[model samples]
Target chain A: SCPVNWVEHQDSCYWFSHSGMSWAEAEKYCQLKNAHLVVINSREEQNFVQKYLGSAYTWMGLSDPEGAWKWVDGTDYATGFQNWKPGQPDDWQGHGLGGGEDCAHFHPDGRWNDDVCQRPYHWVCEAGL
Target chain B: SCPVNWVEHQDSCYWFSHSGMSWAEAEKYCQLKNAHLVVINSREEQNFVQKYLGSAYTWMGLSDPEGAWKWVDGTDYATGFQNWKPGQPDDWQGHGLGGGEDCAHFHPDGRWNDDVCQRPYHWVCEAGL
Candidate 1:
């Protein structure tokens, strides 16, 4: 079973933040809980989170900090599941941040998008049961 | 990652037995491996096992040992997942056994059926990551 407030889906426990934080800060928040930002591995999982998120933009555990995308739980990015919106991960450099977008988050409609790591957003954390 | 012979799916490791055994024997087998007979909690999980099982009947971790259904892992039977074949759980007493069929197994078509606990069948085991 999941902790008091965490939700259980399939074989994992998930925690969705009610407050917002930068991507890096959000990652650290989950780290303190002995968990990692949610690493979605399937379409069913993506759908589950989408329903929970509704219109909220939320952080997931995917990043290209060093120019190579990787999941927090080490799931292979190339062969793993992804549900990006059309024309996403553009890494647009116009956010006044010197670098391109390097973090992944759930868009309002539940598809994924790359964003600047400093942007604040609600996040999800996952821990294996 | 999963153990040497176990397969990793989502956040759990699973072992599909090659040999056949009575339902109770299979449960003991998994216990010796520090695991339990597989407890499916969602459609995706059920489908995953269905694909692996193909045309073979296999034991899952569900039973009504005392006239009350429950998953081996303690997942709530009343509110948890179930995919029984039509008119199933007949508790068919014609198996020549004195008691009603109390153990659950996957039918050849991937749906669940209540069966005699003494029948030999392949079984699946699961352990969390």
Candidate 2:
């Protein structure tokens, strides 16, 4: 198997690949590599990843599928780290594509946007083993 | 003055506009509208806005300037709402762009990435009064 783009950080290796896939598929892929999705805890971590991420959009491990904001690692919503643009999360129904937004992604310039889960784009991954 | 793309949800109205600007500048813009940058709290809210957002990347109200994961609204980092891809937050320096990454953004799908704060892109805003 091809080695995923794993960038070594403090204690773990970070992956920066543009595998355009849904949130679910991406999660599975990471799990296969004996790793889980990325879990950012501080600005330093975010900045570290941002510098490496290319211009194309990539996926992080953050979402609100059940309308409840929670991390896959099972953490509470950190009110301090939210970087929402004003008037965002408008709940726009994509031409009646389905219902509403249930996922989140990181932009190239350090911001967030609510998006559908099915859309494809580059993604990130993490592991320790 | 142009009315911000305000989308009415349950109680408050959300906006969806692509104003490519730095996180700081974007924040000022939202403040001018008597609104603050977006602070997504649920998957429903994220989905609602995702459908309306175009393919272009947009800025949200999230960042880690001090390397501390704190929201502008003074909220704590939510553990339940993380959707990181595998091997993300690689801390890649932008070909001598400057230093490490320090900001976060939302991808079109449901994920996140870190990047420079100076980059330009569309943004979201929110207001109640």
Candidate 3:
């Protein structure tokens, strides 16, 4: 069995790995460990994930199935935290990706993109004591 | 028909309403207008909603079905913003809400609770100019 990758910050332990499951699946994996997908609150945190987790497409907790951006964790959306790539979420219909483009992922270049939640990719998990 | 409640902050217009619907349904409503469920980033904003939108258990944007906290909007989670009221996401199993307790909402008293996403309640929407 693969040991969960643990990233310690302050008193919390964050798990980062390429589980490559849908958003729903990833969330389940985190729950079993008493944690959830990691939420990046700032550029500094984003950098931290990028620096330690290596370069690969990873899932973060953001989506807009109804076209509203929201955190899976139920936090209020802060304008300052939005890091959308230029012309992203163009609301591009079709491509079997729109109308339900609620799941999101962070690209290796630190840019964000909307992808199907079911698509497999690396994901992050967090646990705090 | 009730007109959309538009709250102006800076140059953006945020719509607040008690469109009691499941998390999935609420997201769909926001998408129809090319917008999304509002993401509150700070207490100041929370107060803004409480004052302007009135208290009644409105949704912000967080969840953890797999046990990971994430925003529907894909922004990284920041520790400073968490306002959990003493024991939250207590991992309370059973109750038909735990296996999928990924949805969350803010109580009228400024506390947070895990909820079934399908439940209906007031929700926030946002649009940027």
Q: Which one is best on lDDT?
A: 1
Can you tell me which runs of candidate 2 are displaced by over 4 Å?
A1-4, B1-129
Model 1 chain B TM at: 0.96
* Candidate 2 deviation (Cα RMSD): 19.0
Where does candidate 3 stray beyond 4 Å? Answer: A1-4, A97-100, B1-129
Expressed as tens digits, the lDDT of each residue in B1-129 for candidate 1 is 788999999999999876566788799999999999999899999989988883567899999988899899899988988899999979986543346888999986789999877655789999988
Give all candidates' CA lDDT scores.
Answer: 0.86, 0.66, 0.68
* DockQ score of each predicted structure, in the order shown: 0.01, 0.02, 0.02
Put down candidate 2 lDDT per residue, B77-96, tens digits, no spaces.
Answer: 66525544466555556433
For candidate 3, lDDT tens digit of each residue in A1-129?
234567677555788774355677788889898887877677777777777654667788777776687876775656637666787766554433224456778888877887666455678886675
Which model is ahead, 1 or 3, in terms of DockQ?
A: 3
Q: Give one digit per residue, the lDDT tens place, for model 2 in A28-127.
A: 8888888766777678877887788778666777787787766667645665356655666565665333467666677887576777665555678877
Distance (Å) between predicted and true CA of B54, model 1? 5.2
TM-score of every candidate relative to the true structure = 0.49, 0.47, 0.46
Steric clashes per prediction = 0, 99, 53
* Residue B59 alpha-carbon offset, candidate 3, angstroms: 38
Comparing candidate 1 with candidate 3, which one achieves the higher lDDT?
1
Q: Model 1 shows how many backbone clashes? A: 0
